[PDB]
């Protein structure tokens, strides 16, 4: 009935928000929809997995918000298995590989790869992590499409295509989809392309032991009845001296303040009084979540290893379901794994068929990729389809179609009379990812401490010390790298 | 509590729906979210204004389903005034001219026009009106913005300035914002670009004597206490025998079947049990509504009359707050007004502003384009900002980003167990507009009468006698406009000749 804040979601933004609120001495309900914590982080269990991510899962160096609060949950990392070769899968042919980059042996299509991935950072480097709006050719950026940007930059279909892979791998969505300015903004608050890629020293690096639901459900076990599961938030009134917040069981909440720790678009399903402002209104209709299936094949042991592959392969091309995947297996060796990311227009295309269907698919996808008959044995398969999900909206992370982060971004975390925004969407370092979810139930909480005359204006947003345990190093490049010219520079040397 | 059919939306769409199943004897009941019906229609009455439209408004010729349903109403229509000059404004000059484009004097300019217009027309052919996403080329033309197709197309700044001013106007949004399939299939679900542009002979030809809030008004007292106001619906549940439909006012309604006559992203304010099917789920979160306000500047007389202007002003440039206005004096002659939309980003910018202060620039502006220091002089305004309703989202209607069409366009009206989809983003014909709205409405409301085995199949879809009241004059091209070069064409010419 009556407390301090009412926190929407129960996801790891939310359950930080209220985790922060409670330590601090408030009294903190969260509501939440499902009958789970989590949202778009959800570990299963059963004997033939043990534990499997089937949502978020990846941590990694300069995520150190969510590793702090992981590592004071009691909660450990295991690195992602890349002690072997890589696979470039191109044209029906497997090439591995060491480093981050597939490499490019024709020296036309090296320049283009070079400068595509050069670009991306040089262009980064002029958009403000916390006002991608205020970058200065912010406009020109967000009136086009990466698909617009890829076919201007990249003067070979090799770079056009793995550029293509790249957007649909990171944002889950098509180059024709997204924005320039906001795909740009993506991958440098992320760090840039070196660490938005890398599994060593970027943000594939590490996994939880145990599985990354374990952050929500111990922030739930130390909430205890706080957290009530299965309330739906149908309805917020902010006519009166009080917050009301009501639930679809038809449970009434009384607060001083609000925290909304849902996905921006899912602020659609919440009837305001009174009505939301204009920009907020159309907004929250402009913010759609990407497409994702995430696929775990199971085999007796981990058989690529053999063949000095660590289980990446990166897939190019329109037929392969699975565009990228990753060793899934535990740090002992055991429950050898091989996850796949089914993305973006696939992920609608190949929903239709049964999980079995899906899984002969893969298994002979990764015969063929890893040149291995094992791939056809598996021992089990595990799969979830984000895109099904009422209470998400899909995955990893909402996407901005062009002209709507110049026209609205500024909107996202502006607070509504006493609604403050929460979400890893409103994040500015790692937006999307579980860290930021982290960072913006943070400071989404302490925007509240400040308003209750607890805590200063300039404690609102608070750096992070580096964790110990997973330290981040320098991101280089080569000399050549930096000078190397473009496709169209050395034409005009010519 | 207990009926045949829930209709959730009592605009247009919602209550032909209703008016239609009510009428084939069913139990209806229509739950309204609002404390009035008409939804996106919105007749304001007061002594200053008598009546005046501050949404959809407009009817013409081809849009016989509104005519026929406002007809039996018992309502009339009347003429927008086009009996005077239309006026370009372009770089700071006006250019006064008749019929339904401007023209254009440079023969370059001239052929990069005529060939906008009639690519517009070309590539809707190709277009199912009933599944754009068949088009041979659907693919290709959705993963394009309208901003992208124009740099192709537009081989001037003239003509590619006015293909923006025309997108801007039809549907409310900017170019680089609307996927090229989804904006093509839209003109030629209308009757391609001259009927959707023109006042004489097309769209905007008529208005309903009394205000277009009159069609869900008469309706809704046809209906009486069948219409439920103030009961936004915040939940369905299909998982019984009898669909179970919730209000924020905490009443069940228990039917066998639900129209949802709402804008297809307003149904993300529904909780639905079971979830929804995968793609319904995600099409939901992808169709946002365009961005306008309309306004309403009032005279003591239509003074633009006197220097042979209709009213009509064609408006292009940046600090233009209006890009398009339309005389809105009553058929008598009195409470002489100019009505105007600022649309897209302009709706966005300028919400910022005081009414008072937006009426100061609409003045400016109507004072220069017209050359009338009397457009100074207003007696009145009225104004609407759509994009601040809660239960509509913006106007005229829904918008499709570069990809959606394609991935997600066949659900739009595709059944959900017992829910069927109506309001205007559902037809096939004038989709966006009060037409559209019957056309679903109707639709919807007999593919119930089919699934509860009172008609047949073929009767789920039903064509339109033609208004004796509005007549349809075809759509005519010349010789010159059917067969005069492109620019790139005529440069194709040059190439060949001199070699
Ligand atoms: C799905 C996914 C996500 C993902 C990814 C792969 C997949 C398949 N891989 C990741 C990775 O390897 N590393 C990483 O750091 N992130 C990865 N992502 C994304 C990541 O999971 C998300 O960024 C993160 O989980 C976001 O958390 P946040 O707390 O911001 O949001 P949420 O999990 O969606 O939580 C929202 C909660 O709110 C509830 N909800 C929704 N509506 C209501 C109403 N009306 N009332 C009450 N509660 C509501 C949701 O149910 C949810 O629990
Ligand atoms: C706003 C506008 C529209 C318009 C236009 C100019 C403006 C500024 N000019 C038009 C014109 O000149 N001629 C024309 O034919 N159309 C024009 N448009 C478009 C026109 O208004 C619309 O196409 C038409 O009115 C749409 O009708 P439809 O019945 O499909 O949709 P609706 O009017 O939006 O009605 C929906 C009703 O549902 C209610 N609602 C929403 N959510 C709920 C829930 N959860 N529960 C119950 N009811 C709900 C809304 O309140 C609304 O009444
Ligand atoms: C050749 N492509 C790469 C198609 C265009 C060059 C882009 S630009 O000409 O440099 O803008
Ligand atoms: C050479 C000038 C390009 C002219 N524009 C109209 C800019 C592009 C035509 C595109 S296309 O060449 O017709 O595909
Ligand atoms: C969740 C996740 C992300 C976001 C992610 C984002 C980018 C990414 O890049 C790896 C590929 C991109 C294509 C070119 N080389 C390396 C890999 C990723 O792996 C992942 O598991
Ligand atoms: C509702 C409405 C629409 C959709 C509408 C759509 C297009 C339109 O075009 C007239 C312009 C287009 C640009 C070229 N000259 C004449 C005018 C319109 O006036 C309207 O009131």
């Given at each position: 009935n009556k407390c301090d804040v009412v926190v929407v979601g129960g996801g790891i933004s939310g359950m930080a928000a209220a985790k922060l609120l409670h330590d601090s001495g408030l009294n903190v309900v969260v509501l939440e929809?499902?009958?789970?914590?989590?949202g778009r982080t959800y570990t299963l269990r059963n004997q033939k997995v043990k534990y499997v991510d089937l949502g978020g899962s990846y941590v990694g160096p300069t995520q150190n918000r969510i590793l702090r609060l992981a590592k004071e949950l009691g909660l450990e990392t295991y690195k992602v298995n890349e002690v072997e070769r890589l696979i470039h899968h191109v044209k029906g042919k497997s090439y591995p590989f060491r480093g981050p980059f597939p490499p490019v042996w024709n020296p036309i299509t090296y320049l283009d790869h070079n400068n595509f991935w050069r670009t991306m950072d040089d262009m980064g480097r002029?958009?403000?992590?916390?006002?991608?709006?205020?970058?200065?050719?912010a406009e020109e950026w967000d009136n086009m499409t990466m698909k617009e940007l890829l076919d201007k930059l990249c003067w070979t279909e090799s770079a056009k295509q793995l550029a293509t892979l790249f957007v649909n791998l990171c944002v889950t969505a098509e180059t024709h989809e997204v924005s320039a300015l906001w795909f740009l903004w993506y991958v440098k608050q992320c760090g840039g392309t070196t660490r938005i890629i890398s599994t060593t020293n970027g943000g594939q690096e590490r996994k939880f032991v145990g599985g990354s639901g374990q952050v929500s459900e111990r922030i739930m076990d130390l909430l205890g009845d706080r957290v009530k599961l299965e309330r739906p938030v149908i309805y917020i009134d902010q006519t009166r001296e009080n917050v009301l917040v009501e639930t679809l069981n038809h449970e009434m909440y009384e607060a001083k303040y609000v925290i909304?720790?849902?996905?921006?678009?899912?602020?659609?399903?919440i009837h305001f009084n009174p009505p939301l402002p204009m920009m907020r209104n159309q907004m929250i209709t402009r913010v759609p979540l990407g497409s994702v299936i995430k696929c775990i094949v199971y085999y007796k042991?981990?058989?690529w290893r053999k063949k000095d592959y660590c289980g990446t392969m990166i897939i190019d091309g329109e037929?392969?379901?699975?565009?990228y995947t990753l060793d899934d297996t535990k740090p002992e060796g055991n429950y050898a794994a091989i996850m796949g990311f089914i993305l973006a227009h696939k992920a609608r295309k190949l929903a239709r068929l049964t999980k079995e269907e899906r899984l002969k698919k893969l298994c002979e996808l990764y015969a063929k990729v890893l040149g291995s008959l094992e791939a056809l044995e598996p021992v089990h398969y595990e799969e979830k389809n984000?895109?099904?999900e009422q209470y998400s909206g899909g995955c990893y992370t909402t996407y901005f179609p062009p002209g709507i982060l110049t026209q609205y971004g500024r909107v996202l975390r502006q607070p509504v009379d006493r609604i403050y925004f929460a979400g890893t969407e409103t994040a500015t370092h790692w937006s999307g990812y579980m860290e930021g979810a982290v960072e913006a139930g943070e400071r989404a909480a302490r925007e509240i401490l400040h308003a209750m005359g607890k805590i200063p204006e300039d404690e609102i947003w608070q750096s992070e010390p580096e964790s110990v345990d997973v330290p981040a190093q320098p991101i280089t490049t080569t000399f050549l790298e930096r000078h190397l010219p473009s496709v169209p520079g050395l034409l005009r040397l010519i």
């Amino acid at each position: 009935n009556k407390c301090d804040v009412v926190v929407v979601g129960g996801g790891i933004s939310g359950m930080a928000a209220a985790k922060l609120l409670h330590d601090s001495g408030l009294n903190v309900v969260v509501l939440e929809a499902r009958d789970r914590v989590g949202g778009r982080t959800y570990t299963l269990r059963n004997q033939k997995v043990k534990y499997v991510d089937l949502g978020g899962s990846y941590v990694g160096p300069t995520q150190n918000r969510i590793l702090r609060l992981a590592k004071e949950l009691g909660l450990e990392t295991y690195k992602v298995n890349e002690v072997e070769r890589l696979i470039h899968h191109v044209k029906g042919k497997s090439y591995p590989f060491r480093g981050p980059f597939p490499p490019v042996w024709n020296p036309i299509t090296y320049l283009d790869h070079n400068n595509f991935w050069r670009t991306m950072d040089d262009m980064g480097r002029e958009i403000p992590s916390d006002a991608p709006w205020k970058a200065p050719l912010a406009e020109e950026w967000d009136n086009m499409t990466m698909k617009e940007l890829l076919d201007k930059l990249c003067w070979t279909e090799s770079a056009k295509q793995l550029a293509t892979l790249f957007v649909n791998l990171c944002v889950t969505a098509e180059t024709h989809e997204v924005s320039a300015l906001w795909f740009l903004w993506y991958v440098k608050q992320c760090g840039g392309t070196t660490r938005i890629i890398s599994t060593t020293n970027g943000g594939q690096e590490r996994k939880f032991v145990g599985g990354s639901g374990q952050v929500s459900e111990r922030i739930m076990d130390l909430l205890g009845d706080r957290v009530k599961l299965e309330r739906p938030v149908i309805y917020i009134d902010q006519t009166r001296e009080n917050v009301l917040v009501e639930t679809l069981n038809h449970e009434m909440y009384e607060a001083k303040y609000v925290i909304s720790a849902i996905p921006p678009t899912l602020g659609m399903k919440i009837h305001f009084n009174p009505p939301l402002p204009m920009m907020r209104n159309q907004m929250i209709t402009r913010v759609p979540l990407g497409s994702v299936i995430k696929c775990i094949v199971y085999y007796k042991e981990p058989f690529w290893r053999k063949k000095d592959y660590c289980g990446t392969m990166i897939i190019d091309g329109e037929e392969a379901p699975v565009a990228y995947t990753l060793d899934d297996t535990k740090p002992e060796g055991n429950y050898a794994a091989i996850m796949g990311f089914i993305l973006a227009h696939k992920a609608r295309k190949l929903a239709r068929l049964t999980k079995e269907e899906r899984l002969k698919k893969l298994c002979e996808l990764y015969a063929k990729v890893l040149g291995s008959l094992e791939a056809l044995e598996p021992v089990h398969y595990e799969e979830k389809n984000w895109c099904e999900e009422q209470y998400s909206g899909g995955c990893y992370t909402t996407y901005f179609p062009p002209g709507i982060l110049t026209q609205y971004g500024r909107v996202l975390r502006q607070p509504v009379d006493r609604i403050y925004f929460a979400g890893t969407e409103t994040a500015t370092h790692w937006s999307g990812y579980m860290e930021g979810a982290v960072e913006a139930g943070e400071r989404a909480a302490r925007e509240i401490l400040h308003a209750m005359g607890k805590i200063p204006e300039d404690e609102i947003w608070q750096s992070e010390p580096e964790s110990v345990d997973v330290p981040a190093q320098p991101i280089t490049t080569t000399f050549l790298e930096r000078h190397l010219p473009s496709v169209p520079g050395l034409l005009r040397l010519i």
